[PDB]
Amino acid sequence: LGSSNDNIELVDFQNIMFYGDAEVGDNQQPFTFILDTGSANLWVPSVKCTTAGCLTKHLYDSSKSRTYEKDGTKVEMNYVSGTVSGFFSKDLVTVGNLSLPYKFIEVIDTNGFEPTYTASTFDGILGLGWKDLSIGSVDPIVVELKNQNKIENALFTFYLPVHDKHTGFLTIGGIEERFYEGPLTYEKLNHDLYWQITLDAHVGNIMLEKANCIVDSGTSAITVPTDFLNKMLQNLDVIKVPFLPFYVTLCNNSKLPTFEFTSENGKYTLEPEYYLQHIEDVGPGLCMLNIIGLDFPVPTFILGDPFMRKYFTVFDYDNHSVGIALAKKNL
Numbered sequence: 600l601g602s603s604n605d606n607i608e609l610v611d612f613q614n615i616m617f618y619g620d621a622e623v624g625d626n627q628q629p630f631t632f633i634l635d636t637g638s639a640n641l642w643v644p645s646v647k648c649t650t651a652g653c654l655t656k657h658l659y660d661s662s663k664s665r666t667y668e669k670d671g672t673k674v675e676m677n678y679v680s681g682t683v684s685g686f687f688s689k690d691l692v693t694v695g696n697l698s699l700p701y702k703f704i705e706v707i708d709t710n711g712f713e714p715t716y717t718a719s720t721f722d723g724i725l726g727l728g729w730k731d732l733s734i735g736s737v738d739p740i741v742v743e744l745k746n747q748n749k750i751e752n753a754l755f756t757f758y759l760p761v762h763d764k765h766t767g768f769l770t771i772g773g774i775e776e777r778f779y780e781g782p783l784t785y786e787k788l789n790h791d792l793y794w795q796i797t798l799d800a801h802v803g804n805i806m807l808e809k810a811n812c813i814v815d816s817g818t819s820a821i822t823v824p825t826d827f828l829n830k831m832l833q834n835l836d837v838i839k840v841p842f843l844p845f846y847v848t849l850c851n852n853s854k855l856p857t858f859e860f861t862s863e864n865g866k867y868t869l870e871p872e873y874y875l876q877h878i879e880d881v882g883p884g885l886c887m888l889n890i891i892g893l894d895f896p897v898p899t900f901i902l903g904d905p906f907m908r909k910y911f912t913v914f915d916y917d918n919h920s921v922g923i924a925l926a927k928k929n930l
């Protein structure tokens with residue numbers, strides 16, 4: 600009686616991250632998660648974790664869960680911003696109202712994930728990538744839930760919150776018309792690794808054909824190939840190596856370009872107001888260009904939160920693709 604779909608409310612954290620709650624264990628031990636479409640593993644800190652970081656987080660106690668199932672296989676999870684190690688374990692996992700015996704990593708050592716960990720307010724990370732991207736070859740939860748016949752579509756959507764405007768939602772199971780407007784385009788993945796797609800980029804005169812776009816919820820910014828970044832930054836009001844770093848500019852700079860991503864079936868644009876972090880409290884119309892330079896073997900743009908904040912996105916395991924639509928401003 601309600602939404603046939605599973606909705607998890609999302610809270611924004613300083614416009615750099617947003618969290619969601621899920622539970623682990625027969626007894627429903629609560630946890631704050633960072634929903635990362637950039638990784639494919641789920642881990643929670645253990646009560647056995649004795650590092651400083653862990654003293655402020657919520658901890659999983661297997662001895663309290665009847666459904667706990669020991670595994671003990673040692674594993675080391677590494678991201679771009681750090682590593683965490685622990686051993687595998689299996690226990691009930693409750694995401695929203697869908698529970699399932701899932702296999703996660705129990706973390707006991709987070710000293711290689713600082714100051715990120717301690718500086719952030721989450722307990723663990725819930726990967727949403729593909730199995731080829733995970734450790735121990737674990738099927739994605741959203742996929743599992745499908746095989747276990749708890750949902751009909753191996754898909755989830757993101758309606759990112761907007762710092763100071765509204766909260767967001769992760770929907771597991773189906774697409775809801777209330778989050779977007781305008782057509783809902785679908786782009787195919789070029790690899791069943793990350794939610795990566797191919798698009799043409801256009802800025803000033805700058806153009807990059809068949810660029811690889813990775814859509815990541817765990818990236819506070821938009822990444823761009825370095826060369827692409829500086830050609831872009833020529834003349835525009837912006838220094839190098841600030842006081843709270845990177846690129847800064849008067850939020851009112853009329854020279855700021857609008858990104859253009861076009862495909863065979865869609866055209867998506869990101870205006871300055873979407874990639875500009877504010878810091879006017881440091882200067883009347885002062886802003887933090889939210890664009891990082893990053894080079895991959897082949898031209899790759901990481902469409903992070905700045906993009907997912909403007910555009911509603913659907914991730915489809917069944918039809919291997921990422922759907923994009925104009926996210927509603929307030930529902």
Ligand SMILES: COc1cc(C(=O)N[C@@H](Cc2ccccc2)[C@@H](O)CN(CCC2CCC3OCOC3C2)C(=O)CCN2C(=O)c3ccccc3C2=O)cc(OC)c1OCc1ccccc1
Nearest residue numbers: 615616633635637638677678679680732815817818819820
């Ligand atoms: C929210 O903040 C950010 C968090 C993360 C940030 O750390 N984000 C990761 C999630 C996260 C969020 C908060 C705290 C910690 C970690 C994650 O989404 C990034 N990511 C996916 C896309 C990426 C991103 C960058 C890459 O370089 C090479 O391959 C990349 C894939 C990975 O870490 C992949 C890990 N990973 C691999 O690398 C890899 C290679 C081969 C097989 C399997 C894997 C695998 O599972 C990243 C940011 O962009 C760079 C942020 O903005 C800035 C930032 C960066 C460092 C410190 C602080 C702030």
